[PDB]
Structures are given as structure tokens and as C-alpha cells.
């Protein structure tokens, strides 16, 4: 069983959508991805709920209450073989000095959530 | 009328299980009955990938490890999360119109899903697969 560690992120309160997703994609991802490779993460996914996606969402879910949408700005996901990869990555000195502090730039940790699931995946 | 280039999309369904249903019957139903019912429709409409996330007896002790010192409220406690990766929302809209989809897979949800306590999401995704290829 592969595991998936997901963090549902609400963006910084004084932060625009454009600044938030610019940061996540263009500054945080290149800073983050080296460590995920180092610790043998299988896949890193970033889900974006922004101006590009929101109209297609509205199209998909029109006529339901808006409350029916899980409305985080970004969802961060890594598929790992075990949680030791994550635990070990968390103890990494550079990860702690550079990428962990980076969350000051985009994530409101008081309005974000995490979830560790095990997955079944089917690729067509 | 000229469109910005397409980005991969992820349609996520966040499912709370039927209240009168144990976790074990929830995930067995999801793995063993729904997923095979569902999958042929995902192929038929060119779905790129189908992921089922389980939050259950197997995953929870590891989730508790990762979230040491964090309140229960910080946990997204849906029982299962369904993700289909598609290249355009047209795949999904049209799959949603399929008569057998509506006849079998949609109503199967009365066997595992509390839809009043379920949510949906349509995002665009960036993805990095680390496998050397
Ligand atoms: C919560 C969110 C989305 C910011 C995760 C992230 C990181 C790095 C980071 C920072 C703080 C704690 C952990 C752990 N475990 C990991 C990133 N996006 O670089």
C-alpha cells in the first residue's frame, strides 16, 4: 500500500490568489522537490483551486450550494511507500532551514488541514 | 475563442461514509464493488488516472504519527477521497451524462456514501513523478 500525505492549504490572509499560486509553483516547488527526491517520495502533486480552474468547477457543480466545494487554495500531496520517508525528511537540516520556513510565504497554517491515507491507484 | 493551453485537471470527491455503516464495510464496498463498477466508465471517457484514498484503521495510526501535537480539528476526516485526473472537464460532464453511469454507479453511492456530508472539488494540478523514466 502506497500512502498519500495531503495538506489542504488556505493561503495567507493578506495574499492574493495570483501571489499565492505564483509562489507555490515558481518558488516553493523548486525549493521543495530536491528533498522529496532525496527521501524517495514517489510523486508530488499540487492541486490549485484558482482563476484557471474555478470556472470549470462552477461548470461541473452548478446548481449545488457553494458549500459543497472544498475550497482550499492549494492541496499538497506526496505519495510515499512509508511515513519514515517523511519523518526522516523532516529531520533534514537544510529542509528545516530553507523549505519549512518558506511556508511563511503562502500557507496559513491556522486554516489548513492534513490527511494521511493509503491509496489504490489505476492508471489508464 | 483561442484557448489558453489545457492543464491537467483533478476532480476530487470527498466522501463521508454512511453513518450506519462501519469503516470496514465502507472501505470494502469502496474497494470491491464501487471501484470496478466505476472504472469501466472512467476508461470509456479517457480519464487519465483514478485514485481512491482511504482514511481508516490502516492509515490512522500513521496519520497520528505525522500529526503529533496537532488537534483533531487539523485532520481532514473524510473516510474516502476519489480523484480522477482528466485533460478537460468535457470528459467528466459527458461521463456524468452516461445512462449506465446514472443507472448503476451513481445510485451505488447509497451503499457507502453520505452525500449530504460529502464535498467536491475541481482543481488544476502540477505533478512530479520521481520514477526515473
Ligand atoms: C504545510 C505545507 C504545505 C507548507 C508543507 C510544506 C512544505 C515544507 C514544509 C514546511 C513545514 C512543515 C513540513 C512538514 N512536514 C513541510 C513546502 N511546501 O515546502
Instruction: Name the resolution in angstroms.
Output: 2.2
B33 touches chain A (CB under 8 A): no
CA distance B91 to B87: 8
- Centre of ligand 1 from the C-alpha of residue A4, in Å: 14
Specify whether the CB–CB gap between B122 and B89 falls below 8 A: yes
Taking contacts as CB-CB distances below 8 angstroms, the residues of chain B near A44 are 127-128, 130
CA distance A101 to B51: 31
What sign results for the dihedral spanned by CA atoms B84, B88, B91, B96? positive
Domains, in order of start, for chain B: 9-124 (3.30.70.100)
Amino acid at each position: 500500500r502506497l500512502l498519500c500525505w495531503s495538506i489542504y492549504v488556505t493561503k495567507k490572509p493578506d495574499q492574493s490568489e495570483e501571489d499565492h499560486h505564483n509562489h507555490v509553483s515558481k518558488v516553493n516547488a523548486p525549493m521543495f522537490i530536491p528533498f522529496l527526491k532525496k527521501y524517495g517520495i514517489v510523486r508530488y502533486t499540487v492541486k490549485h483551486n484558482d482563476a484557471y480552474s474555478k470556472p470549470k468547477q462552477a461548470a461541473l457543480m452548478a446548481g449545488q450550494p457553494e458549500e459543497n466545494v472544498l475550497a482550499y487554495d492549494t492541496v499538497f500531496e506526496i505519495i510515499v511507500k512509508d511515513i519514515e520517508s517523511i519523518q526522516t525528511m523532516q529531520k533534514d537540516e537544510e529542509f528545516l532551514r530553507t523549505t519549512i520556513p518558506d511556508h511563511f510565504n503562502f500557507a496559513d497554517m491556522t486554516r489548513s488541514k492534513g490527511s494521511l491515507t493509503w491509496i489504490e491507484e489505476f492508471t489508464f
